[PDB]
Amino acid sequence: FNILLATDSYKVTHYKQYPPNTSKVYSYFECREKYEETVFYGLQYILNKYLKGKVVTKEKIQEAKDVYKEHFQDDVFNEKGWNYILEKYDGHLPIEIKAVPEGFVIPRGNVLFTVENTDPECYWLTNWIETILVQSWYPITVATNSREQKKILAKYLLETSGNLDGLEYKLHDFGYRGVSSQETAGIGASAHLVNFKGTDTVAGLALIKKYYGTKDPVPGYSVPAAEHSTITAWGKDHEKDAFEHIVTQFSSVPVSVVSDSYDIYNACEKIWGEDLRHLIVSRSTQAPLIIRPDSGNPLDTVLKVLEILGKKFPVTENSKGYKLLPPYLRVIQGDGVDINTLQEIVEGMKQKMWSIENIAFGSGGGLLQKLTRDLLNCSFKCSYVVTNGLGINVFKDPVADPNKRSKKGRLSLHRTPAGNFVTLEEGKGDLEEYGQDLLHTVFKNGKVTKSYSFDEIRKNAQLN
Amino acid sequence: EFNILLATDSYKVTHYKQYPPNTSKVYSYFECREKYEETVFYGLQYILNKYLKGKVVTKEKIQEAKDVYKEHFQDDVFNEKGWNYILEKYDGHLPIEIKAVPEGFVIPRGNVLFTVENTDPECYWLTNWIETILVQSWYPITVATNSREQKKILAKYLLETSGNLDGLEYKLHDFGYRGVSSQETAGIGASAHLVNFKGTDTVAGLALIKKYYGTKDPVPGYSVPAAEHSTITAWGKDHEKDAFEHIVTQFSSVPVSVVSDSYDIYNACEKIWGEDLRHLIVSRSTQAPLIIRPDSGNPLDTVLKVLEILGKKFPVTENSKGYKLLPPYLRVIQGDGVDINTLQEIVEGMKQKMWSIENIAFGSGGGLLQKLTRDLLNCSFKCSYVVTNGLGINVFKDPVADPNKRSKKGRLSLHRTPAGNFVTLEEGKGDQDLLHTVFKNGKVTKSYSFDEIRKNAQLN
Numbered sequence: 001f002n003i004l005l006a007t008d009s010y011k012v013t014h015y016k017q018y019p020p021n022t023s024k025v026y027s028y029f030e031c032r033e034k035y036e037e038t039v040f041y042g043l044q045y046i047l048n049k050y051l052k053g054k055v056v057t058k059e060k061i062q063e064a065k066d067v068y069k070e071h072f073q074d075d076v077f078n079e080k081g082w083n084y085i086l087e088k089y090d091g092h093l094p095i096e097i098k099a100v101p102e103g104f105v106i107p108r109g110n111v112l113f114t115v116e117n118t119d120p121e122c123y124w125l126t127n128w129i130e131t132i133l134v135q136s137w138y139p140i141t142v143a144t145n146s147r148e149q150k151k152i153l154a155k156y157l158l159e160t161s162g163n164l165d166g167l168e169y170k171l172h173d174f175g176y177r178g179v180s181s182q183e184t185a186g187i188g189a190s191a192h193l194v195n196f197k198g199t200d201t202v203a204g205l206a207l208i209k210k211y212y213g214t215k216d217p218v219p220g221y222s223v224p225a226a227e228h229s230t231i232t233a234w235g236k237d238h239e240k241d242a243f244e245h246i247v248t249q250f251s252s253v254p255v256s257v258v259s260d261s262y263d264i265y266n267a268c269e270k271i272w273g274e275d276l277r278h279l280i281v282s283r284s285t286q287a288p289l290i291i292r293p294d295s296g297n298p299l300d301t302v303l304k305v306l307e308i309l310g311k312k313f314p315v316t317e318n319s320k321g322y323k324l325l326p327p328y329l330r331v332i333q334g335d336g337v338d339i340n341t342l343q344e345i346v347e348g349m350k351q352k353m354w355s356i357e358n359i360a361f362g363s364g365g366g367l368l369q370k371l372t373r374d375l376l377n378c379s380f381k382c383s384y385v386v387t388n389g390l391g392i393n394v395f396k397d398p399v400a401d402p403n404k405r406s407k408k409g410r411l412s413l414h415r416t417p418a419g420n421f422v423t424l425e426e427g428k429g430d431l432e433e434y435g436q437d438l439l440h441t442v443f444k445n446g447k448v449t450k451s452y453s454f455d456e457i458r459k460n461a462q463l464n
Numbered sequence: 465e466f467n468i469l470l471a472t473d474s475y476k477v478t479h480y481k482q483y484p485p486n487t488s489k490v491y492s493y494f495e496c497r498e499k500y501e502e503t504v505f506y507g508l509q510y511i512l513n514k515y516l517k518g519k520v521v522t523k524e525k526i527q528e529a530k531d532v533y534k535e536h537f538q539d540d541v542f543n544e545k546g547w548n549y550i551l552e553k554y555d556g557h558l559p560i561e562i563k564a565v566p567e568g569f570v571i572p573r574g575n576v577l578f579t580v581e582n583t584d585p586e587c588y589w590l591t592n593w594i595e596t597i598l599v600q601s602w603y604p605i606t607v608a609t610n611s612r613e614q615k616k617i618l619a620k621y622l623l624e625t626s627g628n629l630d631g632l633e634y635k636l637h638d639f640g641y642r643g644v645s646s647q648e649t650a651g652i653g654a655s656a657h658l659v660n661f662k663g664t665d666t667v668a669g670l671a672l673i674k675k676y677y678g679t680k681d682p683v684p685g686y687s688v689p690a691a692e693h694s695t696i697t698a699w700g701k702d703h704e705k706d707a708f709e710h711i712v713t714q715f716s717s718v719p720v721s722v723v724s725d726s727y728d729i730y731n732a733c734e735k736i737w738g739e740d741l742r743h744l745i746v747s748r749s750t751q752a753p754l755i756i757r758p759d760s761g762n763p764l765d766t767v768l769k770v771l772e773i774l775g776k777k778f779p780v781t782e783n784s785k786g787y788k789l790l791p792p793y794l795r796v797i798q799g800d801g802v803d804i805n806t807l808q809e810i811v812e813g814m815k816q817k818m819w820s821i822e823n824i825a826f827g828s829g830g831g832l833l834q835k836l837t838r839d840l841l842n843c844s845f846k847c848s849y850v851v852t853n854g855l856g857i858n859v860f861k862d863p864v865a866d867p868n869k870r871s872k873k874g875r876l877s878l879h880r881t882p883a884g885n886f887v888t889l890e891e892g893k894g895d896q897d898l899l900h901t902v903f904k905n906g907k908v909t910k911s912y913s914f915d916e917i918r919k920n921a922q923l924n
């Protein structure tokens with residue numbers, strides 16, 4: 001990885017476009033004004049992996065110089081500016097980044113982090129690293145979207161059961177194959193794990209362990225589970241044998257068995273319902289059988305599966321008046337699940353007097369891939385410049401779109417007397433009318449000055 | 465350091481225990497299940513080199529995965545013995561064979577694009593282990609396909625409104641670096657876009673192509689100097705003309721793009737470009753035009769209003785089709801809210817107002833590289849053939865409530881009839897196959913260069 005090749009191409013030419021004698025470029029990141037509050041998570045990953053330490057070398061400067069020489073068909077690369085950083089700071093970026101603590105749940109339209117150069121010669125470096133810093137939109141959005149789904153599950157699980165036991169395992173990450181890269185997989189799985197503990201994207205475990213860390217042995221957990229290939233390999237006529245072999249191999253731990261390979265309704269009624277009914281009613285509450293449909297209308301299929309199970313297994317009525325499966329039998333819906341359909345499924349189950357205790361969800365591309373930067377309007381903008389000894393509050397204000405107006409001047413975030421958050425502009429945070437700035441210095445001159453445990457992030461992001 | 469033993473879906477760790485007894489072979493294939501009627505196959509070679517080839521198993525990686533999976537599952541289900549066998553017998557090289565259509569080939573939906581099988585019976589479980597890594601080829605396939613479909617739309621409207629295809633390969637510029645989910649994705653997606661175009665600002669794509677594919681040209685993608693809002697707004701609200709004048713003077717001999725909507729895009733075009741700084745614009749050469757960049761409001765309406773204003777301040781001609789053409793020193797680029805849908809609406813609306821497509825170029829970010837899913841082309845990886853207890857079985861899924869989820873049966877091959885249509889032969893009936901062995905037992909057996917891939921992915 002070469003930081004001098006990790007920016008938008010036109011930013012190579014911007015050091016020649018700022019007003020002369022600009023000694024400071026000061027920029028900020030916000031989720032511009034469902035999705036009223038965002039989970040701020042992912043910046044520390046970028047700092048540790050990409051920005052800290054000696055990130056400029058003679059080899060990297062040469063690589064970038066030759067690349068841009070042919071890319072622009074011209075010499076525009078700021079070779080002397082990058083050489084200065086290598087010579088004066090031993091390849092350490094003279095940058096200061098102040099950010100809200102990761103895991104903080106902040107309403108839209110607030111400053112989340114600020115970036116400024118610490119050396120007047122490096123005024124151009126602030127927005128050079130905009131591109132790599134803006135990519136924090138993705139873990140912010142995954143964590144925010146995951147948390148909004150936790151709100152949905154928490155609300156309906158309480159109304160149908162009276163407690164939240166197992167809430168952290170109600171939404172399981174199945175997104176490894178559906179994202180665009182290995183790195184994206186690890187980032188997005190880790191953002192999901194801010195709110196839940198169930199994941200099949202192993203890349204998230206390794207990313208957390210390396211760039212955040214946890215006191216717990218692992219940040220995510222999973223259970224043995226079948227896919228279609230391991231069932232259909234027994235032959236169409238031996239689906240019963242595949243089910244029996246797998247539940248036997250995993251009788252001391254929860255196991256999930258996909259049941260829609262040929263006929264999902266025949267699987268729940270005949271195979272699980274009668275042929276292999278004895279091995280279902282015999283496993284522990286801690287190691288139940290989990291039935292997984294993977295086709296048809298998500299809400300219609302789970303309701304039709306639950307009702308078939310209600311005819312072959314003892315279903316009771318809990319304290320809230322909702323039907324509850326036996327403790328040795330669960331259902332996971334892991335197909336076509338996003339924030340929209342999840343709401344539809346649990347609301348439909350409640351209308352059918354089915355308790356949310358019976359159901360868990362898996363989400364793949366809907367959790368980690370079908371998300372964009374314009375969902376929360378994640379944006380990075382310059383709000384303050386110092387040119388020839390004068391600090392100037394700068395901003396954009398497009399006439400055809402007042403929603404894209406950006407903030408002015410030096411920014412700070414404050415806890416209000418009512419317990420909420422407000423962003424002050426034009427340096428008014430210096431007066432500390434609402435107490436101290438909440439932005440902490442997390443990166444300064446190539447060092448990560450403030451870091452957070454994943455345990456601290458999970459605590460900051462909890463519900464209620 | 466990357467550890468392929470930690471690069472799979474968690475439940476696949478426990479699958480070696482779920483197969484029928486005496487299973488010796490698992491054979492799987494990738495397809496874009498059955499408007500994107502044809503797909504560009506691209507990106508597998510990157511995956512092969514970066515993650516699958518060479519010594520990918522070590523004693524340390526086995527121990528790391530063992531420790532992780534013990535806590536992850538709260539149980540010992542990691543196939544440490546199977547992975548040790550790979551380390552000892554093949555020096556940590558994967559005993560798998562991969563056959564694939566050549567990269568850049570344009571293949572209709574519902575055909576086999578590559579197949580995976582184990583070459584060692586002890587490693588029956590390994591085929592679906594690396595499914596997770598191989599399935600992510602959906603992304604470069606989908607980017608390259610969607611980018612090519614936009615190139616069809618651009619080529620068709622450029623030919624109607626101008627009679628030629630000059631500059632086509634620079635009409636859709638990659639702006640997606642900040643709008644993608646990771647640095648690796650930016651590299652993969654930008655390289656896939658460069659299969660069809662040559663204009664890009666996502667630099668990571670250049671590095672990927674030179675490392676894993678290679679080109680005879682000095683570089684696979686090109687860009688030009690351009691301003692952002694911070695380089696304009698830093699001059700002060702009252703000094704937008706000074707910012708403009710400084711920037712076009714610093715880049716007076718190359719094309720330069722100046723975003724002109726910081727405060728009022730229509731005032732910038734009529735007053736600042738069309739009057740105050742007009743003398744700096746009418747002097748520029750054809751090879752170094754000013755490119756005016758709107759960035760807000762409705763994409764098609766803002767474009768039409770900018771062209772109208774510029775049409776009154778600068779001499780407009782009529783091309784050899786009856787469509788208006790700005791002077792060669794002035795151009796427009798729309799780089800906001802552009803995807804394949806809004807791109808179509810913009811070129812349609814410009815044709816309606818008799819504006820040539822020569823006047824416009826497009827920049828696409830999230831729309832080109834992020835707003836895409838595995839569902840777009842229904843990219844799917846399924847097991848179609850197993851051998852258990854010495855008996856070969858053609859296997860497939862067929863959910864009753866979704867016939868479109870049906871998969872193919874048995875050993876597969878991809879053939880072309882003498883007429884030209886493509887057919888995937890199932891059940892081993894292929895016994896000329898277009899699938900060539902590209903990976904076998906840890907080595908890349910066949911490679912393609914980016915020039916070859918671009919040649920295969922050309923339009924008709």
Ligand SMILES: Nc1ncnc2c1ncn2[C@@H]1O[C@H](COP(=O)(O)O)[C@@H](O)[C@H]1O
Pocket residue numbers: 173174175176177178200225226227294334335336337363364365366473474475
């Ligand atoms: N641990 C798992 N258990 C069952 N299915 C899985 C698992 N991991 C991935 N998948 C599959 O991968 C698909 C990805 O979802 P999506 O990205 O929404 O298409 C799911 O719908 C499942 O079929």
Ligand SMILES: Nc1ncnc2c1ncn2[C@@H]1O[C@H](COP(=O)(O)O)[C@@H](O)[C@H]1O
Pocket residue numbers: 008009010373638639640642643665690691759799800801802827828829830831
């Ligand atoms: N080379 C570039 N020239 C102009 N704008 C760019 C460039 N690269 C990225 N952008 C920004 O990225 C936006 C498009 O990406 P997106 O918002 O993801 O569609 C543009 O409107 C600009 O704000």
Ligand SMILES: [Mg+2]
Pocket residue numbers: 759799800801
């Ligand atoms: Mg934009």
